[PDB]
Amino acid sequence: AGSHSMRYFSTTVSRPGRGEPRFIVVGYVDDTQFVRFDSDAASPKMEPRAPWMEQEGPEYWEEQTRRVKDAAQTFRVSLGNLRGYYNQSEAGSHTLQTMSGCDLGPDGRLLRGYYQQAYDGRDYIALNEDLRSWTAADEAAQNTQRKWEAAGVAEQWRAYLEGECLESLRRYLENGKETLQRAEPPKTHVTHHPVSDHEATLRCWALGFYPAEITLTWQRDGEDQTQDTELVETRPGGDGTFQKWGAVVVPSGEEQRYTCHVQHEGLPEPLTLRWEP
Amino acid sequence: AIQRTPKIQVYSRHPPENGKPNFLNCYVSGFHPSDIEVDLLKNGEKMGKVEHSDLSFSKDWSFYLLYYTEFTPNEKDEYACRVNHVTLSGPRTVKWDRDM
Ligand SMILES: CCCCCCCCCCCCCCCC(=O)OC[C@H](O)CO
Ligand SMILES: [Zn+2]
């Protein structure tokens, strides 16, 4: 589509008295992973996880490894600060997650830049859209916010998000263009399985699509049935595509009242499907 | 700390055709904290050759993982995924249903 994104997702987990916190980072362009770092690996290094990343040279990888090791050290200090802030025991394991990245608009502009953290799975602090202010979840995060305003942290992220973040995303989008600039439409069909002699399950399938965003809804005479729909979470095929289905259990004589509506970027028109007996 | 129980889906990469090679997938999502144990089960026995994705997480900060192995289905063999997490009584086993 016109908008494309880059994201880094990092997870830091303390394991008190049991060595340094575990630190894992993964990078994504849109819904395609392209790098990883695992601090518990044999030789912890940023390394490629897409074939179109295998043409970067070793100096790129060294710089990426240096940056994540630097971040890892900051996140370990953060975990200690947070435990102290929340008056938590030194024996318990805690998690710091961070997200960062950019949305690149169709004309090359920065649509949105991000830097935010969660502590033990709850929002903690976030860079606002203006890339010059913060939103803090509580007084602990207001403490973090002050230390970050004192160290000029917003300005440093704004510089990267408006510059190197987009430049890198553009390069990846060109290097992996055949993978990343495709919209693979879902292959769709409806199945029918009786549950008695008087009712049946209609299941609407979408398979093999990319990117992951999709809408799949059952309607009965044009009326949305989400309260009666079993809709599974979009799931990876393992091969760079995604799968999803939604299902309703309906009276046999009403089956043709039901339609499944599929919307995906790779589709010229939204689809309307009906059980094809 | 927040705790979120894993969702579990067991499925094949491609529509299962007996005798045709394929990939058996166990997608585990929506969970927190991140420590988890996942096994793929060929007839109630652990499978070797099982690989898994790198730990990542969704907009709500919950984690997801793909566990997968190449396989070739047939009329006999039963397959399943077994997950243990701190939000669970103990290991939960989910059978592979061909039409889900
Ligand atoms: C959500 C994780 C991102 C946070 C770190 C964890 C690993 C990130 C690897 C490098 C990508 C982003 C780092 C870019 C480095 C960078 O330019 O620094 C930014 C600001 O300038 C503040 O210093
Ligand atoms: Zn060097």
Residue B75, CA distances (Å) to A32, B16, B41, B42 in order: 35, 11, 16, 13
Cβ atoms of A31 and A20 closer than 8 Å: no
- Do the chains contact at A9 and B9, CB–CB below 8 Å? no
Cβ contacts of B34 on chain A, cutoff 8 Å? 11, 13, 95
Q: Which residue spans within chain A are E strands per DSSP?
A: 4-13, 22-29, 32-38, 47-48, 95-104, 110-119, 122-127, 134-136, 187-194, 199-209, 215-220, 223-224, 230-231, 235-236, 242-251, 258-263, 271-273
The span from the CA of A113 to the CA of A141, in Å, is 20
Question: Minimal Cα–Cα distance from A237 to chain B, Å?
Answer: 5
Q: CA gyration radius for chain B?
A: 14
E-strand ranges in chain B read 7-12, 22-31, 37-42, 45-46, 51-52, 56-57, 63-71, 79-84, 92-95
User: Which residue is associated with the tokens 């990245």?
Assistant: A101
Q: What are phi and psi of A222, to 5 degrees?
A: 75, 0
Count CB atoms within 10 A of the CB of residue A76. 16
Sequence-distant (≥ 6) Cβ neighbours of residue A72 within 8 angstroms: A12, A21, A23, A39
All residues with CB under 5 Å from ion ligand 2: A 62
- Helices A164-175 and A153-162 cross at an angle (nearest 10°) of 30
CA A151 to chain CA centroid, Å, is: 29
Which residues numbered 90-129 in A keep a CB inside 8 Å of some CB on B? 93-95, 97, 118, 120-123
- Considering only CA atoms, which of A115, A77, A99 is closest in space to residue A11? A99
- Dump the DSSP string for A40-97: TSSS---EE-SGGGTTS-HHHHHHHHHHHHHHHHHHHHHHHHHHHHTT--TTS--EEE
**CB of A117 closer than 6 angstroms to any ligand 1 atom:** no
Measured CA to CA, the distance from residue B15 to residue A207 in angstroms comes to: 10
CA of A62 from ligand 2 middle (Å) equals 6
Q: Is B77 helix (H, G, I), strand (E, B) or coil?
A: coil
Amino acid at A210: Y
A233–B contact, CB cutoff 8 A: yes
**CATH for the stretch B1-100:** 2.60.40.10
The position carrying tokens 């059980």 is A275
**CATH number for region A183-273:** 2.60.40.10
Closest to B26 in 3D by CA, of B41, B9, B13: B9
Report the C-alpha gap between A47 and A20 in whole angstroms.
21
Backbone angles phi, psi at A82, to 5 degrees: -65, -45
The one-character DSSP state at B86 is T
Phi-psi region of A135 (alpha: psi -120 to 50; beta: other; left: phi over 0): beta
* Annotated binding-site members of A for Zn(2+): 1, 4, 59, 62, 139, 181, 192-193, 198, 255
Q: How many CB atoms lie within 10 A of CB B96?
A: 22
Closest-CA residue of chain A to B29: A233
Q: What is the resolution of this structure in A?
A: 1.9
What would the two tokens of residue B18 be? 């007996």
Count Cβ–Cβ pairs < 8 Å, chain A vs chain B: 75
Cα atoms in the Cβ-side hemisphere of radius 13 Å centred on A230: 9
Cα–Cα distance for residue pair B30/A233, rounded to 1 Å: 9
What is d(CA A205, CA A216) in angstroms, rounded to the nearest whole number? Answer: 9
**Cα–Cα distance between A2 and B46 in angstroms, integer?**
45
Residue with tokens 């652990």: B46
Instruction: Give yes or no for residue A67 CB within 6 A of ligand 1.
Output: yes
Domain boundaries, chain A: 1-182, 183-273
Q: Which residue has the tokens 């940023």?
A: A46
Overall size of chain B counted in residues: 100
The Cα A72–Cα A3 span in angstroms is 30
Number of neighbours of residue B50 by Cβ within 10 angstroms = 16
CA distance A99 to A91: 26
For ligand 2, the distance from its centroid to the CA atom of residue A17, given in whole angstroms, is 34
Between positions 42 and 61 of A, the ones with CB within 8 A of B are 49
In angstroms and rounded to an integer, the radius of gyration of the C-alpha atoms of chain A is 23
Cross-strand partners of B27: B9, B66
CATH 1.10.1760.20 fits A1-182, yes or no: no
Experimental method: X-ray
